[PDB]
């Protein structure tokens, strides 16, 4: 159902390091988990450097990141790992999503490379999902982290459309919405995305 | 919901290597998945040697094993990782379940060591679960394996009772049954165990 030590029992807060220094992600999560008694703090506030993302799956990377933060802070740790996985490319860009076009990758060059890679893919074989894996480790050596995996299916376009969001959003067409992820508003994207799903799953698993 | 390539579509069979040479596990799984069109084969039939279990979680080990088999056979791969996690010991024996008492570990010496480790644990603080994590990788570099995690709660006894099963069964008391895992029959244990749960989850995720 999932074991003890994920929430405090329980007038006090439990401090939990989030494995990012990203203030937006930290604000979002601290705000959601607040009510469960979790005091969420960026790993950067506690002097944690970036972990080397050496895993070959989102789950392995999320766990590696969470473990590094927990090991350096001696706190329980939450991490995420996210990316785009294209069926016809066996799940690529996958764990190489952020760095797909190499050293000096940028969002645009990443997406442009994905279009080039997919230029001869038939129109009906362009399925893809964004994935967000969240993990929660009680301590660095916890053998049974909670793991929350959200995903969001779409289809890769042939040209970019829209300027909202980030990353591959301009080429990720969402047939249920009749537009790309970058044409959605932030509120509209948040309601349906892989990250929205994984947060819902997490909040719901901590209820429990 | 979970992506393509886990079942064939679909008069043919898809061969899938199970990451064990254990004939009982292979018979059980081949028999369950048969109907879904999966042709399950022990990794030992295909000449796969044991992978080094280097991960610090059941999920990391199950994935490592599945990836090694898939990489050596070029087949999709299923693996499991299982063990006993005791709350008061932070999840130990955990990934060291099979080897808990070291080099030349046996079931009995493992369990006897767990009793010694837990001898001063109050009677009401002896919670534990067995965990079984099953994973299914489409190929060695698949970034989004299916992951099925079953667990089974119990309480660690102060003495062994019963001679059925294996491993820590003689000291894992199951309050809903009023006996230890080793006092259950094989059919009774199978119906409720961490492995029973993970198989149910897998069979149900392949339905889908
Ligand atoms: O919502 C999203 N839209 C577009 N691309 C994303 C999204 N989430 C993850 N990605 C891609 O996956 C990478 C994930 O790295 P992270 O954002 O560092 O976790 C990002 O750099 C993007 O390349
Ligand atoms: O059903 C069970 N009963 C008792 N111990 C188990 C069970 N499943 C896993 N274990 C323990 O966890 C280890 C798991 O290793 P595996 O059986 O090699 O997957 C076993 O050697 C036992 O030590």
XYZ file of C-alpha atoms and ligand atoms in Angstrom:
462
model
C 0.000 0.000 0.000
C 3.273 1.690 0.784
C 5.454 1.745 3.828
C 6.116 4.082 6.781
C 8.215 7.289 6.790
C 6.769 9.124 3.829
C 4.655 11.441 5.953
C 5.086 12.545 9.563
C 2.846 11.063 12.309
C 2.293 13.850 12.912
C 2.032 17.436 14.254
C 5.636 18.311 13.263
C 6.846 18.713 9.649
C 9.227 16.243 7.985
C 11.900 17.980 5.856
C 12.382 16.318 2.450
C 14.998 17.480 -0.136
C 13.731 17.756 -3.684
C 16.555 16.709 -6.156
C 16.566 19.946 -8.260
C 17.413 23.594 -7.635
C 14.603 24.549 -9.894
C 12.554 27.069 -7.892
C 9.293 26.538 -9.932
C 9.330 22.736 -9.335
C 10.176 23.351 -5.645
C 7.362 25.925 -5.209
C 4.874 23.572 -6.905
C 5.797 20.532 -4.874
C 6.342 22.275 -1.518
C 2.862 23.784 -1.954
C 1.189 20.424 -2.762
C 2.860 18.421 0.038
C 2.728 21.116 2.662
C -0.648 19.832 3.800
C 0.743 16.320 4.279
C 3.307 17.724 6.703
C 6.248 17.678 4.273
C 8.710 20.553 4.361
C 10.140 20.472 0.813
C 13.580 22.056 0.246
C 15.686 22.332 -2.887
C 18.826 20.229 -2.823
C 20.735 23.368 -3.885
C 19.818 25.120 -0.546
C 21.570 22.255 1.200
C 24.668 22.451 -0.950
C 23.991 19.368 -3.066
C 25.749 19.313 -6.493
C 24.176 17.635 -9.580
C 24.360 13.890 -9.754
C 25.620 12.211 -12.850
C 22.667 10.749 -14.686
C 24.108 7.356 -15.573
C 20.906 5.264 -15.764
C 19.334 3.931 -18.916
C 15.698 4.501 -17.816
C 13.761 7.421 -16.290
C 13.138 5.329 -13.182
C 16.926 4.584 -12.776
C 17.864 8.262 -13.208
C 15.119 9.481 -10.773
C 16.303 7.015 -8.224
C 19.964 7.917 -8.723
C 19.180 11.584 -8.234
C 17.055 11.042 -5.197
C 19.724 8.759 -3.616
C 22.506 11.314 -4.128
C 20.496 14.112 -2.507
C 19.415 11.838 0.406
C 23.048 10.651 0.880
C 24.515 14.187 1.007
C 21.714 15.727 3.229
C 20.715 12.654 5.354
C 17.124 13.573 4.516
C 14.431 11.624 2.728
C 14.462 12.689 -0.961
C 12.107 13.183 -3.896
C 13.404 13.257 -7.531
C 11.846 13.241 -10.990
C 13.178 12.163 -14.374
C 11.231 13.134 -17.523
C 11.666 13.009 -21.332
C 10.057 12.215 -24.627
C 9.911 8.603 -25.938
C 9.071 7.982 -29.614
C 7.732 4.508 -30.436
C 9.253 4.107 -33.895
C 12.667 5.148 -32.454
C 12.489 2.515 -29.724
C 11.815 5.118 -27.051
C 14.404 7.731 -28.184
C 15.261 10.523 -27.394
C 14.375 8.922 -24.070
C 16.956 9.503 -21.354
C 18.881 11.623 -23.879
C 15.904 14.047 -24.227
C 17.772 17.107 -22.758
C 21.007 16.379 -24.599
C 19.608 14.821 -27.795
C 21.585 16.996 -30.225
C 24.707 16.719 -28.132
C 27.069 19.064 -26.361
C 25.584 22.546 -26.599
C 22.086 21.045 -27.101
C 19.291 23.618 -26.912
C 15.469 22.911 -27.022
C 15.311 24.046 -30.607
C 18.239 22.083 -31.837
C 16.911 19.010 -29.961
C 13.482 19.307 -31.610
C 14.945 20.128 -35.003
C 17.052 16.957 -34.753
C 13.912 14.884 -33.871
C 12.130 16.197 -37.009
C 15.154 15.310 -39.107
C 15.313 11.797 -37.535
C 11.586 11.278 -38.138
C 11.261 12.842 -41.636
C 10.546 9.601 -43.382
C 8.225 8.200 -40.676
C 4.723 7.620 -42.107
C 2.022 9.940 -40.717
C 0.313 7.144 -38.811
C 3.507 5.871 -37.125
C 4.513 9.026 -35.216
C 3.216 8.039 -31.751
C 5.146 9.353 -28.733
C 4.691 9.975 -24.998
C 6.199 12.346 -22.525
C 7.044 10.520 -19.308
C 7.518 11.851 -15.807
C 8.810 9.509 -13.113
C 8.745 10.699 -9.538
C 10.421 8.721 -6.789
C 10.495 9.106 -3.010
C 13.353 7.510 -1.051
C 13.197 7.359 2.791
C 17.058 7.377 2.922
C 19.910 6.729 0.586
C 19.804 2.983 0.967
C 15.972 2.564 1.119
C 15.324 -0.607 -1.039
C 11.668 0.200 -1.739
C 11.209 3.787 -2.900
C 7.717 4.904 -3.807
C 7.630 5.335 -7.611
C 5.002 7.332 -9.492
C 5.067 7.202 -13.282
C 2.856 9.530 -15.305
C 2.792 9.561 -19.118
C 1.041 11.651 -21.825
C 0.548 10.316 -25.420
C 0.706 12.478 -28.518
C 2.012 12.473 -32.017
C 5.152 14.068 -33.364
C 4.371 16.843 -35.967
C 6.396 17.605 -39.109
C 6.827 21.269 -38.252
C 6.812 23.305 -35.069
C 3.628 25.077 -33.942
C 3.209 27.334 -30.847
C 5.588 29.097 -28.458
C 4.372 28.199 -24.972
C 6.126 25.587 -22.786
C 9.610 24.242 -23.462
C 11.607 21.398 -24.956
C 9.761 19.314 -27.565
C 6.358 20.964 -26.840
C 6.244 22.671 -30.287
C 6.363 19.327 -32.042
C 4.169 17.242 -29.702
C 0.674 17.261 -31.141
C -2.112 16.336 -28.724
C -5.024 14.959 -30.755
C -7.524 15.228 -27.846
C -6.781 19.014 -27.869
C -6.357 19.573 -31.621
C -3.092 21.439 -30.872
C 0.581 20.955 -29.855
C 1.785 21.112 -26.241
C 3.277 24.579 -26.989
C -0.196 25.908 -28.149
C -1.735 24.957 -24.829
C -1.743 27.494 -22.017
C 0.309 26.614 -18.908
C -2.955 25.815 -17.027
C -4.242 23.732 -19.893
C -0.943 21.813 -20.211
C -0.637 21.293 -16.434
C -4.094 19.737 -16.255
C -3.224 16.903 -18.679
C 0.574 16.443 -18.835
C 2.871 13.576 -17.820
C 4.009 15.790 -14.927
C 0.360 16.569 -13.879
C -0.332 12.799 -13.888
C 2.740 11.875 -11.827
C 1.968 14.597 -9.211
C -1.647 13.340 -8.955
C -0.366 9.828 -8.490
C 2.124 10.922 -5.814
C -0.436 13.030 -3.906
C -2.849 10.178 -4.078
C -0.273 7.567 -2.959
C 0.452 9.734 0.074
C -3.274 9.230 1.104
C -2.327 6.245 0.918
C -1.629 2.863 -19.768
C 1.509 1.238 -21.071
C 3.173 1.222 -24.426
C 3.399 -1.106 -27.451
C 5.533 -4.270 -27.802
C 4.619 -6.129 -24.651
C 2.237 -8.492 -26.411
C 2.105 -9.592 -30.045
C -0.577 -8.160 -32.393
C -1.164 -10.959 -32.903
C -1.565 -14.552 -34.192
C 2.168 -15.352 -33.794
C 3.951 -15.725 -30.422
C 6.519 -13.204 -29.159
C 9.534 -14.884 -27.490
C 10.524 -13.207 -24.203
C 13.544 -14.312 -22.073
C 12.869 -14.608 -18.369
C 16.033 -13.500 -16.381
C 16.447 -16.733 -14.312
C 17.255 -20.364 -15.070
C 14.865 -21.372 -12.390
C 12.572 -23.935 -14.041
C 9.671 -23.466 -11.503
C 9.536 -19.666 -12.091
C 9.789 -20.269 -15.870
C 6.994 -22.900 -15.853
C 4.765 -20.595 -13.775
C 5.287 -17.540 -15.923
C 5.320 -19.278 -19.325
C 1.987 -20.856 -18.339
C 0.399 -17.529 -17.266
C 1.557 -15.497 -20.296
C 1.059 -18.198 -22.868
C -2.481 -16.984 -23.447
C -1.255 -13.446 -24.138
C 0.913 -14.802 -26.945
C 4.205 -14.693 -25.018
C 6.678 -17.518 -25.506
C 8.657 -17.402 -22.234
C 12.176 -18.916 -22.230
C 14.762 -19.145 -19.477
C 17.809 -16.979 -20.041
C 19.926 -20.078 -19.306
C 18.520 -21.853 -22.456
C 19.910 -18.956 -24.457
C 23.317 -19.087 -22.833
C 22.927 -16.014 -20.630
C 25.211 -15.919 -17.531
C 24.122 -14.267 -14.228
C 24.257 -10.519 -14.080
C 25.964 -8.810 -11.224
C 23.316 -7.405 -8.935
C 24.812 -3.982 -8.285
C 21.641 -1.954 -7.579
C 20.570 -0.648 -4.213
C 16.817 -1.293 -4.715
C 14.719 -4.254 -5.914
C 13.562 -2.179 -8.879
C 17.220 -1.360 -9.887
C 18.289 -5.017 -9.618
C 15.213 -6.295 -11.582
C 15.922 -3.810 -14.284
C 19.633 -4.637 -14.381
C 18.854 -8.320 -14.744
C 16.259 -7.826 -17.399
C 18.592 -5.493 -19.385
C 21.471 -7.990 -19.330
C 19.282 -10.830 -20.612
C 17.703 -8.584 -23.309
C 21.188 -7.324 -24.359
C 22.686 -10.830 -24.726
C 19.595 -12.430 -26.471
C 18.206 -9.381 -28.404
C 14.816 -10.371 -27.001
C 12.406 -8.473 -24.800
C 13.052 -9.531 -21.165
C 11.210 -10.068 -17.891
C 13.075 -10.110 -14.511
C 12.094 -10.119 -10.848
C 13.931 -9.009 -7.719
C 12.535 -10.014 -4.300
C 13.574 -9.875 -0.611
C 12.500 -9.108 2.902
C 12.494 -5.497 4.225
C 12.244 -4.887 7.989
C 10.985 -1.439 9.022
C 13.034 -1.003 12.192
C 16.192 -1.977 10.219
C 15.525 0.647 7.557
C 14.482 -1.973 5.023
C 17.272 -4.531 5.721
C 18.046 -7.307 4.799
C 16.605 -5.729 1.663
C 18.727 -6.263 -1.434
C 21.076 -8.339 0.746
C 18.243 -10.822 1.564
C 19.911 -13.846 -0.191
C 23.384 -13.051 1.107
C 22.487 -11.516 4.489
C 24.872 -13.647 6.566
C 27.610 -13.310 3.999
C 29.704 -15.611 1.867
C 28.346 -19.121 2.335
C 24.944 -17.690 3.395
C 22.208 -20.319 3.654
C 18.441 -19.689 4.378
C 18.883 -20.821 7.940
C 21.931 -18.797 8.687
C 20.258 -15.755 7.053
C 17.144 -16.118 9.232
C 19.151 -16.904 12.344
C 21.125 -13.692 11.764
C 17.843 -11.684 11.402
C 16.616 -13.027 14.783
C 19.920 -12.076 16.369
C 19.754 -8.563 14.798
C 16.163 -8.118 15.993
C 16.435 -9.682 19.494
C 15.945 -6.454 21.338
C 13.192 -5.104 19.043
C 9.955 -4.592 21.019
C 7.112 -6.968 20.078
C 5.064 -4.210 18.476
C 7.918 -2.876 16.300
C 8.668 -6.014 14.250
C 6.811 -5.059 11.040
C 8.257 -6.338 7.748
C 7.219 -6.975 4.135
C 8.357 -9.319 1.448
C 8.638 -7.482 -1.861
C 8.569 -8.809 -5.395
C 9.364 -6.446 -8.258
C 8.749 -7.643 -11.778
C 9.922 -5.636 -14.757
C 9.394 -6.026 -18.500
C 11.868 -4.376 -20.890
C 11.093 -4.234 -24.657
C 14.883 -4.175 -25.407
C 18.059 -3.466 -23.559
C 17.818 0.277 -23.911
C 14.004 0.618 -23.445
C 13.648 3.780 -21.206
C 10.169 2.900 -19.929
C 9.974 -0.693 -18.714
C 6.697 -1.879 -17.260
C 7.231 -2.305 -13.492
C 4.980 -4.351 -11.216
C 5.651 -4.214 -7.485
C 3.842 -6.582 -5.137
C 4.392 -6.608 -1.363
C 3.141 -8.729 1.586
C 3.206 -7.399 5.216
C 3.903 -9.552 8.245
C 5.754 -9.515 11.488
C 9.102 -11.044 12.311
C 8.805 -13.830 15.000
C 11.324 -14.547 17.775
C 11.685 -18.203 16.854
C 11.200 -20.243 13.712
C 7.911 -22.081 13.108
C 7.046 -24.350 10.117
C 9.044 -26.069 7.374
C 7.266 -25.202 4.130
C 8.593 -22.559 1.695
C 12.113 -21.143 1.805
C 14.267 -18.257 2.962
C 12.823 -16.207 5.837
C 9.381 -17.925 5.666
C 9.858 -19.629 9.084
C 10.190 -16.280 10.802
C 7.606 -14.243 8.849
C 4.389 -14.330 10.832
C 1.233 -13.466 8.895
C -1.341 -12.144 11.370
C -4.270 -12.468 8.900
C -3.457 -16.238 8.798
C -2.425 -16.782 12.432
C 0.714 -18.583 11.165
C 4.165 -18.027 9.571
C 4.776 -18.166 5.810
C 6.438 -21.602 6.303
C 3.223 -22.998 8.004
C 1.152 -22.083 4.976
C 0.743 -24.625 2.198
C 2.250 -23.709 -1.200
C -1.289 -22.979 -2.530
C -2.140 -20.917 0.509
C 1.128 -18.932 0.296
C 0.812 -18.411 -3.480
C -2.659 -16.925 -3.099
C -1.468 -14.071 -0.841
C 2.296 -13.534 -1.297
C 4.342 -10.623 -2.663
C 5.044 -12.819 -5.706
C 1.290 -13.673 -6.155
C 0.534 -9.917 -6.028
C 3.215 -8.935 -8.555
C 2.087 -11.676 -11.017
C -1.546 -10.493 -10.686
C -0.428 -6.956 -11.346
C 1.622 -8.005 -14.389
C -1.170 -10.167 -15.864
C -3.580 -7.363 -15.302
C -1.271 -4.703 -16.816
C -0.999 -6.860 -19.930
C -4.851 -6.432 -20.347
C -3.947 -3.429 -20.310
O 6.793 19.057 -20.578
C 7.804 18.854 -21.333
N 7.777 19.405 -22.570
C 8.773 19.301 -23.460
N 9.877 18.546 -23.220
C 9.960 17.987 -21.939
C 8.939 18.088 -20.971
N 9.339 17.368 -19.855
C 10.547 16.853 -20.153
N 10.922 17.216 -21.412
C 12.173 16.884 -22.139
O 12.945 16.011 -21.296
C 14.072 16.670 -20.729
C 13.913 16.315 -19.302
O 14.927 16.911 -18.574
P 14.461 17.676 -17.225
O 13.416 18.714 -17.663
O 15.898 18.083 -16.976
O 13.816 16.677 -16.237
C 13.857 18.157 -20.982
O 15.128 18.770 -21.168
C 13.102 18.124 -22.292
O 14.150 17.839 -23.256
O 8.765 -16.020 -0.581
C 9.881 -15.796 0.002
N 10.063 -16.345 1.226
C 11.187 -16.219 1.945
N 12.224 -15.443 1.531
C 12.088 -14.884 0.255
C 10.927 -15.007 -0.537
N 11.128 -14.281 -1.701
C 12.357 -13.742 -1.601
N 12.937 -14.096 -0.419
C 14.282 -13.737 0.099
O 14.891 -12.850 -0.857
C 15.924 -13.488 -1.598
C 15.531 -13.137 -2.981
O 16.427 -13.715 -3.863
P 15.765 -14.491 -5.121
O 14.826 -15.549 -4.523
O 17.152 -14.870 -5.598
O 14.950 -13.507 -5.990
C 15.783 -14.978 -1.316
O 17.079 -15.566 -1.338
C 15.248 -14.958 0.098
O 16.432 -14.651 0.881
